[PDB]
């Protein structure tokens, strides 16, 4: 019943437009939303458009389409790589820094091609589509998927039919993330996606500029979950045709590369109007070709990329810290932070790779622990180098007293965070070792384990710095 779906989505829109609930209400709100999304989903028949046969059956047509439009198709082939999915495998030796992959702009799906597509009329009227280039790309993808003769059909027919973003997690798979820092961004993703689906289902079914959309016929929640997951796992920022601005884009062929540690070796060539990728390392014939996606955390890889990357050298966990207005020194601390370019309250990161805290966090902690006299002396100074550059540098303390205070705080705070997790490090390792787990469950348990391993490293680093500066104070002659 289309009128029942319209009533259920109206209810879903209102629920997901409520304000954020207080501390400790987030899980039960997520369960409230899952209940209504699942009831809608089980009343619908999955993806509106499906392709018979195997995913690999369509890769030859992708290579042929890419070749005819000026892209590189020589020296690699599309292969199944088990738990990494499909990817590129070298057919011949490829040297590091060798240009081996390129994709002309005509092949890309962009916000610009979305504007000139069947979505164009609705794009020009809808406030959300105009503001959210990633949402516009998602609907561009759904519109072309539902088009029988879309130019990008060879690309769309080779995209995965599902993903491992948390949108696809079962309830108990998300439950593994209770009391983690990452779960809050999982909650947000689910609520955003459900709100957007309900909003656009109403728009597509009622707006006159949507009357000719291929989605007015059928537009299921699974359609929208697939579109946003496709975009978040694969989208890229590229310059516009003249280079004056940037835009979001899906890049066929190149986006089949899987991820490894390294540096970005993909850039846009504006002069030749194409994406270009040089080899991250030497790849021998028969070896998988990897690229480096970007310096993202494992929370970001799980939530936005749908995988957990082992030995992520950029892994980190978010921590929120601020000066309280109850602090009798709030005004002076806020003034010092402003001079340093740091907000009074903000989100920092604790890093896996040494050092565990950045210059920004060290600067904040120093200011947070300054005495009134240290604040006055700092504000009286005016050397440009002392606004932030020395303030965040480990070898330029305010005072040994200040160091002891800030490391004591950081040790206690990282220790406090560890105590709030539902499981310990070794409990997690026992689950991973002795249990048969789904792919998505393993991602969740590895993620919560990784958060705690970072926090314990921060505890031990803060403790040794506290002990070091306490020793320096004790050894100072009286």
């Amino acid at each position: 019943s289309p009128k029942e779906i319209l009533n259920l989505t109206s209810e879903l829109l209102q629920k997901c437009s409520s304000p954020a609930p207080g501390p400790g209400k987030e899980w039960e709100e997520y369960v409230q939303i899952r209940t209504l999304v699942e009831k809608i989903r089980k009343k619908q028949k999955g993806l509106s458009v499906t392709f018979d046969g195997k995913r690999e059956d369509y890769f030859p047509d992708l290579m042929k389409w890419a070749s005819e439009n000026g892209a590189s198709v020589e020296g690699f082939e599309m292969v199944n790589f088990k738990e990494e999915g499909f990817g590129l495998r070298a057919t011949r030796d490829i040297k590091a820094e060798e240009l081996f992959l390129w994709v002309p702009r005509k092949l890309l799906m962009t916000v610009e091609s979305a504007k000139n597509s069947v979505l164009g009329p609705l794009y020009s009227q809808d406030r959300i589509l105009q503001a959210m280039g990633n949402i516009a790309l998602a609907f561009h993808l759904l519109c072309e998927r539902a088009s029988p003769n879309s130019f990008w059909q060879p690309y769309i027919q080779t995209l995965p039919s599902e993903y491992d973003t948390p949108l696809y997690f079962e309830e108990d798979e998300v439950r593994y993330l209770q009391s983690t820092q990452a779960i809050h961004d999982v909650f947000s993703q689910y609520k955003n996606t459900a709100r957007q689906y309900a909003y656009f289902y109403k728009v597509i079914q009622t707006h006159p500029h949507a009357n000719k959309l291929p989605l007015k016929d059928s537009f299921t929640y699974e359609d929208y979950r697939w579109a946003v997951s496709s975009v978040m796992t694969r989208q890229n920022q590229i310059p516009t045709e003249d280079g004056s601005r940037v835009t979001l884009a899906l890049i066929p062929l190149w986006d089949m590369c899987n991820h490894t540690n390294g540096l970005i070796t993909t850039g846009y060539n504006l002069e030749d109007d194409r994406c270009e990728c040089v080899a991250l390392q030497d790849f021998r014939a028969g070896e998988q070709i990897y690229i480096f996606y970007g310096t993202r955390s494992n929370a970001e890889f799980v939530i936005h990329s749908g995988f957990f990357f082992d030995n992520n050298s950029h892994d980190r966990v978010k921590i929120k810290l601020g000066v309280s207005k109850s602090d009798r020194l709030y005004a002076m601390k806020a003034e010092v932070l402003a001079r340093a370019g740091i907000p009074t309250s903000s989100v920092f990161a604790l890093h896996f790779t040494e050092p565990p805290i950045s210059a920004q966090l060290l600067a904040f902690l120093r200011v947070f622990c300054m005495t009134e006299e240290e604040l006055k002396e700092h504000l009286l100074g005016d050397s440009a180098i002392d606004r932030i550059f020395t303030l965040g540098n480990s070898e330029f303390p305010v005072s040994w007293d200040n160091e002891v205070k800030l490391w004591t705080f950081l040790e206690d705070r990282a220790s406090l965070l560890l105590k709030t997790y539902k499981t310990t490090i070794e409990e997690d390792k026992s689950v991973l070792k002795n249990h048969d787990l789904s792919v998505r469950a393993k991602m969740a348990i590895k993620l919560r384990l990784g958060e705690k391993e970072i926090l314990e490293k921060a505890v031990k680093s803060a403790a040794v710095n506290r002990e070091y500066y306490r020793q320096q104070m004790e050894e100072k002659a009286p």
């Binding site: 990633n134 989208q235 890229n236 590369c257």
Partner: peptide, 16 residues
């Protein structure tokens, strides 16, 4: 080095 580096799956804001 790269005038326009491309980050695969760059994180964007989805809060409309």
């Amino acid at each position: 080095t790269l005038k326009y580096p491309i980050e695969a799956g760059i994180v964007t804001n989805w809060d409309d």
